[PDB]
Structure formats: structure tokens, C-alpha cells
Design a protein around this ligand. Structure first.
Ligand SMILES: CCCCCCCCCCCCCCCCCC(=O)O[C@@H](COC(=O)CCCCCCCCCCCCCCC)COP(=O)(O)OC[C@H](O)CO
Ligand SMILES: CCCCCCCCCCCCCCCCCC(=O)O[C@@H](COC(=O)CCCCCCCCCCCCCCC)COP(=O)(O)OC[C@H](O)CO
Ligand SMILES: CC(C)CCC[C@@H](C)[C@H]1CC[C@H]2[C@@H]3CC=C4C[C@@H](OC(=O)CCC(=O)O)CC[C@]4(C)[C@H]3CC[C@]12C
Ligand SMILES: CC(C)CCC[C@@H](C)[C@H]1CC[C@H]2[C@@H]3CC=C4C[C@@H](OC(=O)CCC(=O)O)CC[C@]4(C)[C@H]3CC[C@]12C
Ligand SMILES: CC(C)CCC[C@@H](C)[C@H]1CC[C@H]2[C@@H]3CC=C4C[C@@H](OC(=O)CCC(=O)O)CC[C@]4(C)[C@H]3CC[C@]12C
Ligand SMILES: CC(C)CCC[C@@H](C)[C@H]1CC[C@H]2[C@@H]3CC=C4C[C@@H](OC(=O)CCC(=O)O)CC[C@]4(C)[C@H]3CC[C@]12C
Ligand SMILES: CC(C)CCC[C@@H](C)[C@H]1CC[C@H]2[C@@H]3CC=C4C[C@@H](OC(=O)CCC(=O)O)CC[C@]4(C)[C@H]3CC[C@]12C
Ligand SMILES: CC(C)CCC[C@@H](C)[C@H]1CC[C@H]2[C@@H]3CC=C4C[C@@H](OC(=O)CCC(=O)O)CC[C@]4(C)[C@H]3CC[C@]12C
Ligand SMILES: CC(C)CCC[C@@H](C)[C@H]1CC[C@H]2[C@@H]3CC=C4C[C@@H](OC(=O)CCC(=O)O)CC[C@]4(C)[C@H]3CC[C@]12C
Ligand SMILES: CC(C)CCC[C@@H](C)[C@H]1CC[C@H]2[C@@H]3CC=C4C[C@@H](OC(=O)CCC(=O)O)CC[C@]4(C)[C@H]3CC[C@]12C
Ligand SMILES: CC(C)CCC[C@@H](C)[C@H]1CC[C@H]2[C@@H]3CC=C4C[C@@H](OC(=O)CCC(=O)O)CC[C@]4(C)[C@H]3CC[C@]12C
Ligand SMILES: CC(C)CCC[C@@H](C)[C@H]1CC[C@H]2[C@@H]3CC=C4C[C@@H](OC(=O)CCC(=O)O)CC[C@]4(C)[C@H]3CC[C@]12C
Ligand SMILES: CC(C)CCC[C@@H](C)[C@H]1CC[C@H]2[C@@H]3CC=C4C[C@@H](OC(=O)CCC(=O)O)CC[C@]4(C)[C@H]3CC[C@]12C
Ligand SMILES: CC(C)CCC[C@@H](C)[C@H]1CC[C@H]2[C@@H]3CC=C4C[C@@H](OC(=O)CCC(=O)O)CC[C@]4(C)[C@H]3CC[C@]12C
Ligand SMILES: *[C@@H]1O[C@H](CO)[C@@H](O)[C@H](O)[C@H]1NC(C)=O
Ligand SMILES: *[C@@H]1O[C@H](CO)[C@@H](O)[C@H](O)[C@H]1NC(C)=O
Lengths: 523, 523
């Protein structure tokens, strides 16, 4: 117990005379998240309403492919960072590409540059009379910008977090944990700023001035990272010999094609360090595989709660002061970010010291398990609430309005959703931070970026699997989501059952995760 | 991992050339449980319908006081067993009083002996015309039999289980665990036999022949235990010096009135053995305190599920073959016993070897936690089911009939309750057995009976607290249970919310229990 007090110095003393570097990293993360959320917030609406009037399916497919690219590039971004480059040079290059690609969107917004580009001058004005129509317009430039921005975001997301973490590695895992809590805090702050401001301006001032701001944010991110480069000196990996380790992994896998790995490696030219790293990689892959369902349910719940909310009473006299023409459809997502913003400081300053006081959770795996339990509880809460709403819709209905679509909602206040999102926030502040800490901590010192990329790739796989599941339950045979052929008319569909299904899926996952967690520590 | 295979001999080899003693103990346990459940199954109905027509409140109060006495006597029964007597002699004496007291009821059933006793000859026939009426009749004899039987059951329940466990103590905790699995199996088998057979005979043949059988069961229990006494020789504690240990606990508590206990004890005449036992007692008391809410929710769910079932469609063509005049109201309780009967063999023969194979749960506390999680899941399932039933009652209703009361039920098959009871059974086969194993294992070798009695007393405390809670939510101000002024009309009350409340109470308990469990192992 007394040794815990000895470690108390590291916790408070983590941010020793090096706070500037950590601040720079956090600021860069904030700016990049703000830009990313600004891009993804209303991309569908921008495409649909733009003079290049695509079909809703086309825009949805574009966004889905963009997100998939963001998930896919991450392991490759980590490979690039750890091989043939350093980490910092990788961040700089990725952010340069990020800015270059994202630049395109505001030009497309500006009518003069819009006409100058695409060599099409497509101004069919959607519903305006037109002699037939073409397919997705402005395809070359739009796709090019999308691929550039997606690759940039994937590479930065894979490379920055281990870069920041290894910054304070001089201290202990307690210091790393504190850094990670504040990292997630900054991420959420950027998400809030973007989703609130930029969405308000885009949906209520203009796209031309709306898409301009994210470009500025990414530019400032570039400048701040570049300036901090001089004072970082954060034990830069300078990965040039790291190139060798990546090729050796194949050589270890060559033995498979040619503790089985350990026995053959010792005799051959497989000096023990590489054997240990490959063994670690094998050990960790199962853990991400086991987290896949957690990502599935997480992303599915995140998507579903928004449609649930859209059909509850919108409060606050509909913002009587400064009447909200076209109330933006992003603050609904921002709710969870608000809750995490409130929670994280309390956690970091009170709970973690308390738990570390006596003997409590010293490992991240247990924290992920706790988060999963909280997710399950939240899913049940949401199911119950949606059940009551469904019984409450059979009576009269109120014609509310969000964006420019006349939703149908029940006479139930949106605040009733508070317990769900609260449990979600608790689950996130446990799980997400524990998972990032685990990914950084377990990976061999040579290829941390690669393992972080793999982590994010598996998260993307889970998101895609969840989307597939949502499509599956929509089949007529099941009939849970049959009238969901548009923005949404959940009133006619049984979403409550879906929440319970997620709870079951999450519940089973927790038990499965516990088994693997136990096995991992033993070995 | 290989040491697990070494322990495999104990698991299979637990029942070495000593199977006769364990068989005798299990048979005695089965007979005693059968008698106890036969007594408690329709005591209220027997009193209300007997020529000594009490009021429903009077009979309910009588049963409640009887159960409370059963819970209260347990620590005192353990004290008696461990001091001034041995365990076997305590069992014999307790069963003798058990039989003596229980004998009364069949005489009261027999009209000739009924008239001979009570010196009252109360034959007012309930609804038959009567010039006024008196209070609870046959009070002296009925109360005397009830107190005798309650004290007997408390003492046997406290004394037998550690007696059986220490029988196979030559082997390891794996052997003890196997014994406890089969102990619970026998308990459930006896419960099934009683609740089915004896309840059918009582409610469908006659009380005179119905209450005779439990007397026979307790008599055979006495005889089998007496006969096995010769071959038991199960390292009988022969507690005569154990008397000293109990008085010293006060002396350790005298230091409090005169590791604080350890420091003063070493210097004084408090040889370290007693210091260790008192320290252990202090450590364990918190654990029972922490389990109190688990007992609360367990007993509350057990009671509530029956009323839930009573309003679902009664299946099986109402037992078309041999039409069930006055379908008994005990098989509804017997459902859970059936499920545990099916589960326990599978657990014992498959799951426990599998878990012990690699590295999995080696401690009972974790098993109790798992059971609690399963209870929470079952509570949520029941809440959802009751919610759907409540929405399904608003339409037409069906007048079924159980006992002789015209219940109102919804057009929903009773089988829908299967998942609830399945999860309950899983939770029981984990928790209950783990808890018995813990109580026996942690207690100092001198006073195991006392700690088992304390365990059962805390279980009773939890049951009483749960009853108080159910009364509480019935208040008009809350209105969840307002029309429940009789056998039950939950159709007009919101039972579903109550199930969720238990889930929350259970959910919080699990987190609390985990903290204490962790602290216990550390110390
Ligand atoms: C290792 C990976 C395993 C798979 C993991 C993915 C998720 C598995 C769970 C998927 C659950 C599917 C839906 C629930 C299972 C029962 C089928 C069902 O939904 O029953 C409906 C009844 O539908 C049917 O009977 C149609 C059956 C279609 C066949 C496909 C579904 C069966 C399951 C297929 C997947 C396999 C799952 C195995 C169990 C894990 C009930 O809806 P309802 O009609 O009562 O709705 C209310 C109202 O009346 C509107 O209709
Ligand atoms: C360390 C020990 C702590 C205590 C542990 C015991 C259990 C604690 C939890 C007890 C829960 C009580 C009921 C739920 C709390 C909110 C009050 C409530 O039930 O609200 C009702 C509304 O009732 C009220 O507003 C009356 C309030 C009465 C005051 C007493 C209840 C408050 C809580 C008292 C106990 C303290 C609990 C603190 C929280 C843990 C809702 O029912 P309804 O009227 O909407 O029902 C449907 C239909 O409309 C029929 O009416
Ligand atoms: C939610 C739906 C869409 C399913 C999602 C995929 C699951 C079926 C995956 C997720 C986690 C996976 C498990 C993760 C880890 C392992 C350990 C693995 O065994 C090892 O230790 C690998 C090395 C060896 O072969 O010895 C065997 C497969 C298994 C149980 C996996 C089986 C398949 C699981 C359950
Ligand atoms: C760690 C502890 C808190 C246990 C873990 C589980 C709890 C967080 C769960 C158990 C029961 C759940 C509750 C069950 C039912 C409801 C009612 C539900 O509200 C409605 O459906 C209607 C509201 C109205 O209009 O009055 C909101 C969620 C809530 C509070 C749930 C919130 C989450 C709770 C407390
Ligand atoms: C903050 C956490 C820890 C407590 C649980 C969540 C709260 C945010 C809930 C609990 C009580 C709820 C309130 C209780 C009662 C109502 C009445 C409710 O009105 C109706 O049901 C009728 C609607 C109409 O006619 O306008 C509107 C929401 C409101 C204020 C609820 C808003 C959300 C509250 C504050
Ligand atoms: C390669 C093997 C080992 C399988 C694992 C690869 C995954 C990346 C696959 C498996 C299932 C796939 C999903 C199956 C079904 C769909 C539904 C599909 O949705 C639609 O196009 C219909 C609805 C709409 O139009 O929006 C979108 C792709 C998605 C999520 C797929 C994305 C890619 C997934 C997750
Ligand atoms: C552990 C995981 C992988 C499997 C368990 C997932 C459950 C949450 C699913 C599986 C089957 C589902 C049930 C299948 C059928 C129905 C009937 C459905 O409609 C009715 O009530 C009428 C049905 C009829 O008319 O027969 C209501 C939901 C319910 C109970 C579903 C609720 C959600 C359940 C329990
Ligand atoms: C270890 C795994 C299985 C996760 C732990 C939790 C599960 C056991 C829970 C999650 C969701 C629950 C289900 C949610 C909803 C339902 C529907 C419910 O039935 C109804 O509401 C109506 C049934 C009908 O008439 O169709 C019966 C319980 C059940 C299957 C529940 C059973 C228990 C489940 C599977
Ligand atoms: C009774 C039958 C029908 C259930 C079939 C499924 C079982 C095989 C599952 C249900 C719950 C599972 C358990 C859920 C959680 C855990 C916790 C985990 O225990 C730990 O080691 C926790 C950490 C520690 O002990 O320090 C090991 C796996 C285990 C026991 C699981 C083992 C497999 C179990 C028993
Ligand atoms: C469900 C409702 C009716 C409440 C039921 C009673 C609870 C309030 C009890 C059950 C478990 C109890 C806890 C069990 C054990 C302890 C440890 C105890 O601290 C010790 O270790 C005692 C020795 C010391 O004083 O140092 C302090 C009280 C506490 C937290 C208890 C506080 C009160 C609790 C939560
Ligand atoms: C065994 C476990 C692992 C699976 C889940 C629990 C089962 C016991 C459930 C699942 C499907 C259920 C059946 C699905 C559909 C129905 C129709 C249902 O009929 C109605 O809802 C209408 C009633 C009428 O009109 O008579 C009667 C119950 C029954 C047979 C259910 C009985 C209970 C079943 C077998
Ligand atoms: C002594 C101090 C430390 C409190 C702990 C002692 C417990 C044994 C007490 C606390 C609350 C009591 C309960 C509070 C309220 C009631 C309701 C009461 O029910 C009625 O008489 C009304 C309903 C009916 O007539 O059936 C029965 C006793 C009971 C369960 C009590 C039984 C004894 C309890 C559990
Ligand atoms: C962790 C433990 C100790 C506390 C949490 C227990 C919950 C399961 C309780 C506390 C408050 C309860 C809620 C209080 C009020 C209501 C309103 C009640 O009635 C209505 O739907 C109308 C209410 C209105 O008109 O305002 C429905 C159940 C609900 C949500 C209750 C469901 C069960 C809740 C969430
Ligand atoms: C974020 C705020 C608003 C939540 C306030 C309540 C917390 C203080 C609770 C919520 C969940 C609780 C946890 C639930 C379960 C556990 C498991 C337990 O961990 C173990 O030691 C498990 C066994 C092992 O590690 O081997 C220690 C207590 C802990 C972390 C609890 C500590 C207290 C926590 C964090
Ligand atoms: C629709 O036509 C108007 C008037 O000609 C023009 O100003 C506007 O840009 C067109 N809209 C789009 C989306 O191209
Ligand atoms: C009611 O009266 C009948 C006929 O006199 C008698 O046989 C019966 O025992 C009485 N019932 C009771 C419960 O005493």
C-alpha cells in the first residue's frame, strides 16, 4: 500500500518541465478533430443540396467509402511512420496532405471556383426542370479531395497518439494514463467546438464560409506542430532501423511457411528481441478480435440514439431567443461529447487517485470490461425508454421540424434520454482510454504506430459489421426496421427490440472479453 | 497449468471409500427439506380453511413469524452445536424436536384429535352463520408446534451443512465443492418431491393424509441419520473445548471495552490462534453485510415471479388427462427447482472441469459476482416481459382459475417466462454454492457452525428487508402496487417498474460486492 504513495509523485509529477510539448500535441489533436468533424458533419447534405445534385444513396455511399478509407489507411500509415521515416516527419507529411486535399471543398462551395472546376458547370438545381440528368458530378475533384483527406486523417490518427504518449514516457504508466485522459478530453473539446459552431454556420450562414473554417483549423494545426518540432525533442524514434523489424516479422512468418516460433527462432538468426516482439503481436491480435463486437455495438448505439432523439420533444421553447431557423442536426451528436467533457476532469482528478489509493484497478483490461458492462446497462435503459415512447406514440402526434424535414415525435421531453448518455459517457471514459493505453503499452517499442493502426482498423471493421447488422434486421422477414427508407419514421418500426439485441450482444461480449483478458495476463 | 492435472485426482477421487456417509447426509437433507416445504407450502390455506377459521392477515403473520424464527435460531443453533455438544448430537436433538413439534399438525387435521385438542371445539365453518367470533383459535398448540419446528429447522440448517462438508475435508476444496454441488442438488430434489406430491395430495386429497407424509419424512430422516452415526466417524469435532473459544471472543472484545486486537492480544493471554480467529470473524462480517442486498433481491424476485406467472395463460390444455380439480399453486415455485435439477449435473460434470482446466475461477467470491450479474440480467428480462404483458392486458381478458380463485390473465403463454427462470437457475448454481463454500472455508476451524448460522441469519435479514421494500413501494404516493390487497390483481398495478428497480439494486450491489471481494483477498 505504501508503494502507491511512492507512485503518487509520478502522477502529479508527470507534467514535469515538459508541458509545452504536451500542450502542442493536444492543440494539434483538437484542431484536427475539429476539421474532421466539420467535414463529416453535413457532407451528405452538402452534396445533395449542391448544384451537383447527387442522389441520397450516392452521397451516403460517398461518406461510407470515405470513412472506410479512414479506417483502412491507418495500419499503412503506421507502417509508413515506423519505416523509412520518423514519427514527426510522418505527422507533418500527413497533415500537409490533409490540408491539400481538404482545400478543395471550399473552392467547390465558391460559385466562381465551382464553375472553374469540374469542367461541367452543373447547375441543374436539383428539382428545377432538367432534360434528363447525369451521374455524380464533379466526381474527379471531389473523389480526389476525399481520398487525400481520408488518407491524411488515417495517418495522423495512427501516428499522433503514440507520439504524444511516448513524449512523457520518461515517467510511468500513471503519467501515460494522465496524458491519455487529457488527450481524449481535447478530442472531445474539438468535437464539441466543430459540431456546434461549424455546423451552425454551415446550416445557417453559408457553406462557402462554413467549409473555409476547417481549412484554417488544419492550417493552424500544421503551423503549431511545425513550430513545436523544434522544442519537442521528445526522444524522437527516428525510425530508420525500424525498417528491419518489419521485414523480420515475415521471416518469423517464414518459419511458419518453412511456442513453435520461439523454438526455431533461438537456433536461427532470430535474435530473441524479434522473437519477443512477434510473440507479443500474436498475443495482442486476439484482444482486438475480441473487442470487435464492442466496436460494433458502440457505433451502432451511437448512430441509433440520434434517430431516437429526433422523435422526442425538442425543448427550450425551441430556442425562443434568436429563433433557430433550421435547427442543426449536430448538437444531438454533441450531447455525448458534452457529457464526456464534464466527466473526464472529475475522473482524472478524483476517481483515479482514489482507486490507486488502496489497491484497485491497476490494469486496462479490467477497465475495458467495466466500460462494456456500463454499455450494456445503457442499452437496456435505451430499450426501456424507446418501449415507453412506442406505447406513447399511439396517441396524438406533434409535427416538429429539424433541418427542413417534418419529423413526427411523441409528447415526451428529450431530457428523458439523459441516463442513457450518462452511462455512455462513463463507459467511454473507462473503455476508450483504457484501450488506447493498452494498445500503446503492449506493443513492442519498435512498431507502436503499427499496432495503433491495427487497433483503429479493427474499430472500423466493427463499425462496418454493425452497419451490416442494421441492414440485416431491416429485412421484411424480421420487420424491425421496415419503414426506415428515408431520414426516418421510426414511429412505424420497433427500434426497442434492437436496443435489447445490442444489450445481449454486448452482454455476451463482456463474458468473452473477460476470458481472453484473463488468459492474456497469465501469459 | 500442470498442477491443475495434479488436482484432477482430488476432484474425481473426492468420493473415496467413504461414499456411504455422504449418501446418508444427502438423504437426511432431502427428507428434511421435503418436510419443511410440505409444511410451508399451504400453511396459510390450511389455517384459513381449517375449522379454526383465522383471518388472512392472521395466517400471513403466523407464517412470517415462523420463517423469521427459522432465520433467527440459526446462529444460536450453531452456538449450541459448537459448545456443550458435538455436531452429530446437535443434529440428532434438533431433528428430534423437529419431529415432535411437527407431529401436532396432522392431529389438528384429524377431526377427532382436533376436537380433543385446543379445548375449544371451534367448528364455526368460516362463512357459516355464527354469533360473533373469537380470535385465532387453537393458538397454544399451533404456536407451540410452530416454534418447535422452526427452532428445529434452524438448528439443522445451521449444523448439517458444515457437518457434511467436513466429512470429505480429508481431500481438497475441489472435493468440498463437489460435495456442495451435490448437496444443493439433493436440496432441490427434495423441494421438487415435496412441492409436487405433497402439495397435490393436500390441495386435492385431504390435509389429514397430506400432513401425515412430512411427519414420516422427518421420521425417516431421524432414523437414517441415527443409523449412519455408527459409520460416520467423520472426524467428529466432539466440541467440548470449543466452549472456550466462544468465551474468548468476548475477551478479545473485552480488550475493545478495556490491527488493534492483534497488538494487545500478543502481549496478553490471547495465544495467537484466538487472535487469528477473531481477526477472521471481523474480516468475514463485512462480506455477509455486502451480500444482504443480494438476498433481498433474490427473495423478492422469487416471490414476485409467482404472481407474474399467475396472470399468464396456463398451458397444457389445463392438464386435459386427469383434469386438475384445483390446480395446485406450488408447481409455479417448483419451476425453478426443476431448472436447477437439470443444471447442476451439467455444471458439476462439464463446466467445473473445463474451468479448472486452464486457469479460470479458483475463488468463490468471483462466482458470487457472476451469479449476481446473471440475477441482474434475469431481472431486466422479467421487466421487459411484464411490460409486454401489461400492454397486452388492455385488450380482452381470460378468466382462468387456480386454487379456487378466479384470476385474470392475458392471452400470453406461461412458457414465455422460461428465460427468466433459466438465468435465475444459472445465477443460483453459481452464487448459492459459492456462498456456502465460502462460509465453510473462511470460518475458523473451531466455530464453523456459528458462521453458517450467521450466514443464514443475514439471509433472513435480507428477506425481511425485501418484504419491507415491497410494502414501501405499495404506498399510494408511489402507486406501483395499489390494488394488491388480495391474492393478486397485478393487472391494475405496474409490476414491471418493480423488476427494473430490483435490477438497479442488484446492479449497484455487484459493484459494491466486487470492491469488498477485492479487499478481502488482499488481506
Ligand atoms: C458468431 C456470430 C453469430 C451471429 C451474431 C449476429 C447476431 C445474431 C442474432 C440475430 C437476431 C435476429 C432476430 C432475432 C432472432 C429471432 C428471429 C426474430 O426476429 O423473430 C421475429 C419473427 O420473425 C421470424 O420468425 C422470421 C425468421 C427469419 C429467419 C432469420 C432470423 C433467425 C436468426 C438468423 C440469424 C442466426 C441467429 C442465431 C442465434 C444467435 C420477431 O419479430 P416479430 O414478427 O414478432 O416483430 C413484431 C411484429 O410482430 C412484427 O412482425
Ligand atoms: C442505502 C439505502 C438507500 C435506499 C435503498 C432502498 C431503495 C431506494 C430506491 C427507492 C425508489 C422509490 C421509487 C422511485 C424513486 C422516484 C419516485 C417514484 O417512484 O416516482 C413516481 C412518482 O411519484 C412521486 O413523485 C411521489 C414521490 C414520493 C416520495 C417518496 C419516493 C422518493 C424516494 C424515497 C426513497 C429515497 C430514494 C433515494 C434514491 C436512491 C413514479 O411513478 P408514477 O406515478 O409515474 O407511476 C406511473 C403512474 O403515473 C402511476 O402514478
Ligand atoms: C458479433 C459477430 C459479428 C461476431 C464477431 C466475430 C467473433 C465471432 C469473434 C470476435 C472475437 C473472436 C475470438 C478472439 C480470439 C480467439 C482466440 C483464438 O485462439 C488463439 O489463442 C489463437 C492462437 C491459436 O490458434 O492457438 C481462437 C479464436 C478466438 C476464440 C476468436 C473466435 C471468434 C471471435 C469470437
Ligand atoms: C451501477 C448501478 C447504477 C446499476 C447499473 C444499472 C443501472 C444504471 C440501470 C438499472 C435500471 C435502469 C433504469 C431502468 C428504467 C429507466 C426509466 C427510463 O425512463 C423511461 O423509460 C420513462 C421516463 C418517463 O417518461 O418518466 C429511463 C432510464 C431508466 C432510469 C434506467 C437507467 C439505468 C438504470 C438505473
Ligand atoms: C440527472 C439524472 C441523474 C436524473 C435522471 C435524468 C433526468 C434528466 C430526468 C429525471 C426527471 C426528469 C423530468 C421529470 C418529468 C418531466 C415531465 C415531462 O413531461 C411530460 O411527460 C409531458 C410532456 C408535455 O405535456 O409537455 C417532461 C420532462 C420532465 C421535465 C423530465 C426531464 C428529465 C428529468 C429531469
Ligand atoms: C473479408 C471477410 C473476412 C469478412 C470481413 C470483412 C468485413 C469488412 C465485411 C464483412 C461484412 C461486411 C458488411 C456486410 C453488409 C454491408 C451492408 C451494406 O449496406 C448497403 O449497401 C445496403 C444499405 C444501404 O444502401 O445503405 C454496406 C456494406 C456492409 C456494411 C459490409 C461492409 C464490409 C463488411 C463488414
Ligand atoms: C445472445 C444473443 C446473440 C441472442 C439473443 C438476442 C435476443 C435479445 C433476441 C433473440 C430473439 C429475440 C426475440 C424474438 C421474438 C420476439 C417476438 C416479438 O414480437 C412479439 O412480441 C410477437 C411474437 C409472436 O407473435 O410470436 C417481440 C420481441 C421478441 C421477444 C424478440 C426480442 C429480442 C430477442 C429475445
Ligand atoms: C450472457 C449473455 C446471454 C448476455 C446476458 C444478458 C442476456 C441473457 C439478456 C440480454 C437481452 C435479454 C432478452 C431481452 C428481451 C427478451 C424478450 C422477453 O419476451 C418478451 O418480452 C415477449 C416474448 C414474446 O411473447 O415473444 C423474454 C426475455 C428476453 C428474451 C430477454 C432474455 C435475456 C436476454 C437475452
Ligand atoms: C451454466 C451454463 C448453461 C452456462 C454456459 C456458459 C458458461 C460456460 C459461462 C457463463 C458465464 C461465464 C463466465 C463469465 C466470466 C468469467 C470471469 C473470468 O474470471 C476471472 O478470471 C476474472 C478475473 C480474476 O479472477 O482475477 C473467467 C471466465 C468466466 C468465469 C466465464 C467462464 C464461462 C462462463 C461460466
Ligand atoms: C439495500 C438497502 C436496504 C441497504 C442495505 C444495507 C447497506 C447500506 C449495507 C450492505 C453492505 C454494507 C457495507 C458492508 C461493509 C462495509 C465495510 C465497513 O468497513 C470496514 O471494513 C469495517 C471495519 C472498520 O470500521 O474499519 C464500512 C461499512 C461498509 C462499507 C458497509 C456499509 C453499508 C452497506 C452498504
Ligand atoms: C428455450 C430457450 C433457450 C428459448 C427461449 C424460451 C422459449 C421457451 C420460448 C421461445 C419461443 C417461444 C414460443 C414462441 C411462440 C409462441 C406463441 C404464443 O402464442 C401467442 O402469443 C398467442 C396466444 C394464443 O392466442 O393462444 C404461445 C407461446 C409460444 C408457443 C412460445 C412458447 C415459449 C417459447 C418456446
Ligand atoms: C434493528 C435495526 C438495525 C434494523 C434492522 C432490523 C431488520 C430485521 C428490520 C429493518 C426493517 C424491518 C422491516 C420493515 C417493515 C416491514 C413490513 C411489515 O409488513 C407489514 O406488516 C405490512 C404488510 C402486511 O400486512 O403484510 C413486515 C415486517 C417488515 C418486513 C420489517 C421486518 C424487520 C426489518 C427487516
Ligand atoms: C440505483 C438505484 C438505487 C436507484 C435507481 C432506481 C431506478 C430503477 C428507478 C428510480 C426512479 C425510477 C423512475 C421514476 C419515475 C418514473 C415515471 C413512471 O411513470 C411514468 O412513466 C410517468 C411519469 C410522469 O408522469 O412524470 C415510469 C417509471 C419511472 C421512469 C421510474 C422507473 C424506475 C426508476 C428509474
Ligand atoms: C464516473 C463516476 C460518475 C462513477 C462513480 C462511481 C465509481 C466510483 C464506480 C463505478 C464503477 C465502479 C467499479 C466497479 C467494479 C470494480 C471492479 C474491482 O476490480 C477488481 O479488483 C476486480 C478483480 C481484479 O482486478 O482482479 C474494483 C472496484 C471497481 C473498479 C469499481 C470502482 C468504483 C467504480 C469505478
Ligand atoms: C438555382 O438557380 C439560381 C437562379 O438562377 C442560382 O442562383 C442558383 O445558384 C441555382 N442553385 C444551385 C444549387 O445551383
Ligand atoms: C362444516 O359443517 C359440516 C357439516 O356439519 C362439518 O362436517 C364440517 O366439518 C364443518 N367444517 C369445518 C371446516 O369445520
Amino acid at each position: 500500500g505504501a508503494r502507491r504513495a511512492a507512485a503518487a509523485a509520478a502522477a502529479a509529477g508527470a507534467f514535469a518541465g515538459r508541458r509545452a510539448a504536451c500542450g502542442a500535441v493536444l492543440l494539434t489533436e483538437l484542431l484536427e478533430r475539429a476539421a474532421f468533424y466539420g467535414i463529416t458533419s453535413n457532407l451528405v447534405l452538402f452534396l445533395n443540396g449542391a448544384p451537383f445534385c447527387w442522389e441520397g444513396a450516392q452521397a451516403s455511399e460517398a461518406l461510407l467509402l470515405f470513412m472506410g478509407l479512414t479506417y483502412l489507411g491507418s495500419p499503412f500509415g503506421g507502417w509508413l511512420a515506423d519505416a523509412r521515416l520518423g514519427r514527426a516527419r510522418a505527422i507533418l507529411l500527413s497533415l500537409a496532405l490533409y490540408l491539400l486535399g481538404m482545400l478543395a471543398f471550399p473552392l467547390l462551395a465558391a460559385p466562381a471556383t465551382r464553375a472553374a472546376l469540374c469542367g461541367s458547370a452543373r447547375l441543374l438545381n436539383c428539382t428545377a426542370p432538367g432534360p434528363d440528368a447525369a451521374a455524380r458530378c464533379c466526381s474527379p475533384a471531389t473523389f480526389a479531395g476525399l481520398v487525400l483527406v481520408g488518407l491524411g486523417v488515417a495517418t495522423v490518427k495512427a501516428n499522433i497518439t503514440p507520439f504524444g504518449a511516448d513524449q512523457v514516457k520518461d515517467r510511468g504508466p500513471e503519467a501515460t494514463r494522465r496524458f491519455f485522459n487529457w488527450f481524449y478530453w481535447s478530442i472531445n473539446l474539438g468535437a464539441i467546438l466543430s459540431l456546434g459552431g461549424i455546423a451552425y454556420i454551415q446550416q445557417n450562414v453559408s457553406f462557402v464560409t462554413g467549409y473555409a473554417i476547417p481549412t484554417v483549423c488544419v492550417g493552424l494545426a500544421f503551423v503549431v506542430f511545425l513550430c513545436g518540432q523544434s522544442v519537442f525533442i521528445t526522444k524522437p524514434p527516428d525510425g530508420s532501423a525500424f525498417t528491419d523489424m518489419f521485414k523480420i516479422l515475415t521471416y518469423s512468418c517464414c518459419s511458419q511457411k518453412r511456442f513453435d516460433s520461439c523454438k526455431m527462432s533461438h537456433g536461427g538468426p532470430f535474435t530473441e528481441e524479434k522473437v519477443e516482439d512477434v510473440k507479443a503481436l500474436v498475443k495482442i491480435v486476439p484482444v482486438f478480435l475480441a473487442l470487435i463486437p464492442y466496436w460494433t455495438v458502440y457505433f451502432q448505439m451511437q448512430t441509433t440514439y440520434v434517430l431516437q432523439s429526433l422523435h422526442l420533444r425538442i425543448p427550450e421553447i425551441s430556442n425562443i431567443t434568436t429563433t433557430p431557423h433550421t435547427l442543426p442536426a449536430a448538437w444531438l451528436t454533441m450531447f455525448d461529447a458534452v457529457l464526456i467533457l464534464l466527466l473526464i476532469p472529475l475522473k482524472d482528478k478524483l476517481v483515479d487517485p482514489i482507486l490507486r489509493r488502496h489497491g484497485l484497478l491497476p490494469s486496462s483490461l479490467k477497465r475495458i470490461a467495466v466500460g462494456m458492462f456500463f454499455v450494456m446497462c445503457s442499452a437496456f435503459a435505451a430499450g426501456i425508454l424507446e418501449s415507453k415512447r412506442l406505447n406513447l406514440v399511439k396517441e396524438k402526434t406533434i409535427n416538429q421540424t429539424i433541418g427542413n424535414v417534418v419529423y413526427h415525435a411523441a409528447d415526451l421531453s428529450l431530457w428523458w434520454q439523459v441516463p442513457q448518455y450518462l452511462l455512455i459517457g462513463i463507459s467511454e471514459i473507462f473503455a476508450s482510454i483504457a484501450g488506447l493505453e493498452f494498445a500503446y503499452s503492449a506493443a513492442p517499442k519498435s512498431m507502436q504506430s503499427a499496432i495503433m493502426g491495427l487497433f483503429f482498423f479493427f474499430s472500423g471493421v466493427g463499425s462496418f459489421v454493425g452497419s451490416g447488422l442494421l441492414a440485416l434486421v431491416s429485412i421484411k422477414a424480421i420487420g424491425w426496421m421496415s419503414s426506415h427508407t428515408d431520414f426516418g419514421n421510426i414511429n412505424g418500426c420497433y427500434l426497442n427490440y434492437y436496443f435489447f439485441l445490442l444489450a445481449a450482444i454486448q452482454g455476451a461480449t463482456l463474458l468473452l472479453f473477460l476470458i481472453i483478458s484473463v488468459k492474456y495476463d497469465h501469459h
